[model samples]
Target chain A: RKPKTGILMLNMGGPETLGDVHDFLLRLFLDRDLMTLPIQNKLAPFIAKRRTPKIQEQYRRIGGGSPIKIWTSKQGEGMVKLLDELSPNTAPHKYYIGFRYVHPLTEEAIEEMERDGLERAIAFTQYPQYSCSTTGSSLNAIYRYYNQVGRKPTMKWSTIDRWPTHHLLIQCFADHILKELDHFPLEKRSEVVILFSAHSLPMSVVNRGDPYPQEVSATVQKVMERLEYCNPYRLVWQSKVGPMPWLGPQTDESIKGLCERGRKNILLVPIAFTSDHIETLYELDIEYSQVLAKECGVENIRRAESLNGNPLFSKALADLVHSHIQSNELCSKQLTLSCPLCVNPVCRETKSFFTSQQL
Target chain B: RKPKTGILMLNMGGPETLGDVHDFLLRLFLDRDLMTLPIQNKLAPFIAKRRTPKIQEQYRRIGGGSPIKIWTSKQGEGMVKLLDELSPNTAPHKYYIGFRYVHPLTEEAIEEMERDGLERAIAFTQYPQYSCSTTGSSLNAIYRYYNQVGRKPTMKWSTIDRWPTHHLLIQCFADHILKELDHFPLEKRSEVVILFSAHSLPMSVVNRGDPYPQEVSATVQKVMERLEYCNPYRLVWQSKVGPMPWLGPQTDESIKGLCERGRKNILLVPIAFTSDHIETLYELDIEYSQVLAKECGVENIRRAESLNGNPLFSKALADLVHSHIQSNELCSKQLTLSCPLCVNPVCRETKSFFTSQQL
Candidate 1:
């Protein structure tokens, strides 16, 4: 006898290459669920249509197109391969990669799951740090599709929304940080200020008591404690939009300050983030690093490798899913059923079945 | 004979001291214009009702109330006094503080101006860094109010949407940065990194070609150039919302890295911002500073003083206004009406104002 359960992997998709910028942005902006404004319904399409061309050109500069879709697919494939290698005795269950807005939608993915006849399922977002707006929103969208269609999967289900202090995940970051530090002079490594950079959010979210900042802090704390480095370190938010108030000490400013103080070596660990999204690939790696090396007089500005297809991270995901499923079995089935929608469907629907859902 | 002009200063009002948090948040969430979601409209009151008690308690911890409205009023009064001092021979035109949501509504201010028999007026938002979402939105609301009633005033608008490179403003920031460095040990002062932080916005705005980040960067570059500090410096955005993808490298994460790299002393200078709003007063001053101190192991973290009631800042505003008015004269005709309802009106009386009269 073997365990047979489906697995759902969530991700924020990007343009597979720079060429996909127009379609990528179009998919991003056209989805009514994300970036809703006062005049969003009427205005979003208008704004998206007008802006896509220019944005596409920006993508052209970065690579050829956004590598998000391709990268996500690869990530999904890698997970599937790993799962099979780890549990060969289990009936081969389908692994679906659903994009929230674009091609592979949640609805389509669910239909595929039905076709595959996988009874039990485990859903998890790729974002190591769970946020109501990100992973929560995606899950909400998926659940809404299940309810609206008036059909439900009969098998038991489990979810992994966040894994802030996953031991292996923390180790992965620690390893990358140490590896990057090797590039700097031995004496300067001690002088190298570590900057753990993450993406920023608006202050309104914090005022609303979103536990995101706290979660990021917890991850940073756990990693630093594990490393036990005496070198000074700090966390910062980056890639903020202009005009409205957002959460702060920004990353670039922090880097500049490090350089000003004659700290020639600086190591930036994007702790709160995982994959190589635009913030990391474009802004931090290319733009900020250049600024630090050129204008700030920083002798070394290095970023740790993102947790993209890291074997240890993939294993952590597998372990997380296995443990989460085991925990669910231990809890009463009645208690699980009592939870509305089990996994939040509304959040998934709001972001739409774009990147996270695959066709 | 000197110039004569009525000046209306616009600001986003804060909760007057901490006690008003409940009502303040209620007002914020309840405002139909602020929360655009159909569900938000329905859920706002419900959520506010539930969240008010907790928020009120939070405000009590901060000092029992928000001092924004009072501080803004003082700023308005100070600006009026400073302008009068700058140009003693000019007619002492009435200066009014208009808040978008709460007390001292734009309509009331306009009505007061009408009562004062001022046939003409100039409107300006107090936020030095303008965003379409904030200053533009506020002005749009005011314009709409003026149109609802057929009464039109002769108007001369002098909008200072941005003053990024203002010499006095830069110097004010420089002085504050220097003062913040004083807190560090004398030997560590030179090692202190200067972080020029500003509020965050959605990356969509930048992709849409909003000049906000550029303007903030310009300010940072200008200030840094003027100060000629040998230490490193960079510009970063802060205070973003979660769940949805926003602009990145977050401030807290940046600070974490700085701490890890052995940078003990850090100075945070909020450049794109003008006052000690929630983003500054709570997010950076309290929450982030605490995180840097505790988690990141940075011993010294000090925020530069906000440009609230600074004499140099007031003088700069006076000079800016003087130059703007001098350069652009008011339209010659009295009430040269474009729309019987102004070009961009706030509201309509169920009847089409445009249809009511022949073009």
Candidate 2:
């Protein structure tokens, strides 16, 4: 009877801290949802057992653990607080956090909404850009969950799959980069070259027509344009795994070349990721910084602060949700209402329960 | 004939700290050896073009680049010096730096060695643990190169694929961890938990009997046992790619669990990796530490110093090489000196390469 708006936050769950490495990795590798290697059917448990001890050791360094889940939860709370401040009429709008794998399944969130008697909701992936691998998969998971439960929310749901050209998002990055510039000596500022890095994925995904790379580039370009940074810059990819060809200007190689060429100042921007996941923590800060500053003789290396807890990011998200709520037309092109079993013709099917819904 | 021993150093090339993102990622993504996506044949260039701009932006944030290549070169030079000091009699033994996919190809290295009139050489991958994906692949590439050139050295040739339980290598890690202990108050030592993380791979690699996970765990166990660190510890996998199920105790998830359980102090030790790369830089340092400290309430996060320029590691490698040169035995049962074209029966063939040759 009442018009209510709810928000859904999506994240890639991680171990809360170093101590939870064993169980955390267990859930991650064991979950058929996140990764689906061909040997998973047979060697999942064996692989988990074999890897647990060593992986735990890596978590012990860098303060003995990861804080992804906690941060994700905090992000959820932050979003809720922002929504409350932005629109009191939507104050009671529910905020639910859904991880594609692990605990707090999308079904659980839907059930909570059903119990709360909320009518309409907005789905937003924490990732700034859209990718079939992440946002697309999570959205599809939510739909399947509802299908299995044979229940739907009382009102229509709107999805903000991506805001590739969000101006506020660009400003947040620009502001952070500007702040980082303060740490460098004034003389080094002009010599500084901006480098952008994104997570590496198998090029196969792109060939299948996934718009991940295009969307990431669009976001980066808009951010650069807003920042008005015209100095020399380049883009690369990181966190590539195994022998599979991943999309890249592999970040480390690029850095070494710069150092060899006598480019002394370097500023790094992790564009594809909004949160400070392991990609940012281990890859950029400790690993690359040590190599660049300590070994390569690069005079300075700095990373832009992440969007986590940034007020501007929160405002941008709140504004996006508000605009969608105010205009039904906003939902028409961006939103799709498919049955639980509905599959996008272009969506590559992986063998996961989340994608097994009957249309 | 004089006793001859040649040393070769291996490294995972990275973007120098921030400026070289586009060219770096271009080389990285374009490398057929690293990525083997299903559509890589058709889509690599398109994906590279689409993703380059965005990746460059990420590199810009952390001061415009990666420093792996330069650092790696430094490590190589350091190793050369160490080798010279340790085995001056092996002056005839030259040191070669062979990158897997980038410049200074193994073929070129072999050609250089031949020109130097070295008749015998020992092949060894810098990595301590053996994986079909990394060391195996590189060695295979080198072997193919030798075959392609039709220039085999007259002297005996042997390989040292891995050393899972080298006492010196373990001590190197142990000493690095103990050094981090100095940064914190003495009382906080016991509060620290060691988290060992290795790069993740598909579970299929294990199912197919790849010894990577087992070898990685063996190294961790040996390190822990030697250090007598009764503090809590565990292992996890990081940088998982694709939708395929990978080996787990996913590093990020483990950190969250620890945080929720109120463990604040963490020591991260990257056991599987020898040098700092993206996994250590972005994944462990920037991403994990920020989340743990800011969100999970983790007060202290310290990663064990990587074995870059460590005298002990170089000595250990030299010792391994000496043993191989003297005894002519492969360090472990896993390494065999078959013709380059013949794939090990135990090796899982994931993708077929045009250059792959069988003798």
Candidate 3:
């Protein structure tokens, strides 16, 4: 009989309802592993309280609440459905969604995995680019829950932490970019500037030698190469949360600058995320394309579609896991080494815990 | 009778020699306002120890240590010389260099100002853009010294906290950009992509509602306007210290991306600073234009001269101080208000203290 395995997909999940926004924001700010805010215990609650109304309004504009849960669940189910066929040895794979913030948190997902009596499990991060703040935080949450609860499931574990330059992943991005470009007139399509926008990281995190920037850059580079450098493209950043300087040419400013240079036919590709979320739905669509783009006098500006329900992206996810299972590797070699400036205690323990697991 | 006034020129001073790099880096990392690190008290030392050798080499490549002190001194003396003539009411202006994290520290400069028995003083930040991490930190240091040491000068205090869009300041940048563009063929000069690079701040500080980014953008916009938008230009960021994602399209990556688009004739402008530092002499000149540019097949790439010892820059400084004294304002209105997310006790007291001073 094939072994029973749980494919646990992790993300920084959004609130499913207006009521969930406060808890989501509070939990997001409270995670020191993700970001260290000043007097976070007190400040997180204050910021969440203040930002909740504005965030709820954003959700209201986006057809009420986030579609991330729905999209992630669909993606997970679809990937596992294919996983059972492709990897017969680990057949009968069960899909589980673990969110860092919001419903079905990583610990709850782990508890469900425990209840299922799965013989093997995979902690798979949905973030294509590995950031200690994202994948690291989720993994730490898993570690915290398992260690604190003293609930050891009869399961061996491995991970798919990052796949920034995966072949199918690059293909998916290029496909989306190409589709967006076609929206412009064919005569002007070649002149259309492609802007691959990803969430900005703090320089403090960047300086820690967080591999996110480099990894994201690699993905953009690979995608461009896949397109044979068919059009001019630049990887910009967006969704800067506060007054802190985030990675820039910010998406809005990029649009303004491009319009200033008379290049209005611009395509914004949301490169980092695999599915639709606030960053894409409201930030790119509403705040940027709908508002900032129009303000920039950019008539031809449009964002490329996210890989929400793309079958190819599911295939990419399944193929990545299948290859990892066949390779019999515990994790990527890059996963073992902490950032040069990494001071996280959880990183060391969680990494060891996962790597030491035996099937 | 002319009043004796002191112009305390503040900067994040660099090491004058290899030996100074360790302490310089140590102090920079130790400051919580500049950035918050995990186990910062311990991590700062480790980071300084590890980064010292690499930083020392960078200083060595720039003809040994940073020239910020020398340039700032020259600029200060020259500015004061002009100030004596520009503002006869505040004539006999004495110049003092205050270096953060080095000899002639803010307190040392303040001590000198007190010793000189100047009845009035102006804390003049050398940073064109006001960042809490830069100008704010310097002001905080002033407050820290005065509070901790139980020392208060007999003089009244005012400040030139930010001058991002000063006409002469814009003129200096435009002049330097024009001079560098002339290095390229006249036909290619108009097409030369001018990248204005500034030191990046952490997103934590940025989200704290730091005004640095907008201020820097204002400077860039004014300079571009000064040049009549003769060439396409971008405001990019550089010298990101750690793995925290800083403001981007970073200078190095911007160069690579610009070159990739067949836009090789690029001119780099160090916009935030007034003089040559490790950022300009090593990072921009040696590391980027010399190494990365060559790798990107960018033979025509060049960095514009820093405003070190520029007669116009000195005049701009003198004019700025002259205007501030005449305006009778304690500080920019923005200085009185802390960032929306600021939790620093020092910020509250320092701002109130400075604003409440009686002349």
Give the Å shift of residue A54 in candidate 1. 5.1
**Residue-wise lDDT of candidate 3 within A1-359, one digit each (tens)?**
44398889999998998989999999998998988778899999998999999899888877789889999988888898899999888888988999999888898898888888888889989999888989889888988987898876468889888887789998999899888888999888876877778888876676554657656766776687689667766666777777864555566655665565456687889899876656543244555555545565666767799999999999999998899889777766557656545667788788888878885
**Per-residue lDDT of candidate 2, residues A1-359 (tens digit):** 24366677876555555555556566556544345667775666677677777666656654556555566666666666777667777666667777654456566776676667665666677777666667777776766666567764464566666776677887888888788877889877766777777886664453233445545655655565566544445555666767875655466656665665566777888788876645433244566666656665878767887777777777777777777566552232212212112225322322122223221
Q: What is the TM-score of each candidate against the true structure?
A: 0.46, 0.46, 0.53
Q: Name the weakest run of 10 consecutive residues (lDDT summed) in model 2 chain B.
A: B350-359
> Top model by TM-score, which number?
3
User: How much DockQ does model 1 earn?
Assistant: 0.01
What overall lDDT, based on C-alpha atoms, would model 2 receive against the true structure? 0.61
- Which candidate, 2 or 3, has the higher TM-score? 3
What C-alpha lDDT, on a 0 to 100 scale, does residue B122 get in candidate 1? 61
Q: Distance from true position, residue B258, model 2, in Å?
A: 46
C-alpha positional error of residue A250 in candidate 3 after TM-score superposition, expressed in Å: 1.1
RMSD of 1: 22.2
Model 2 RMSD vs true structure? 25.3
Tens-place lDDT digits, model 3, residues B294-315: 6656657678998888899889
Q: How do all the candidates rank in terms of TM-score, highest first?
A: 3, 1, 2
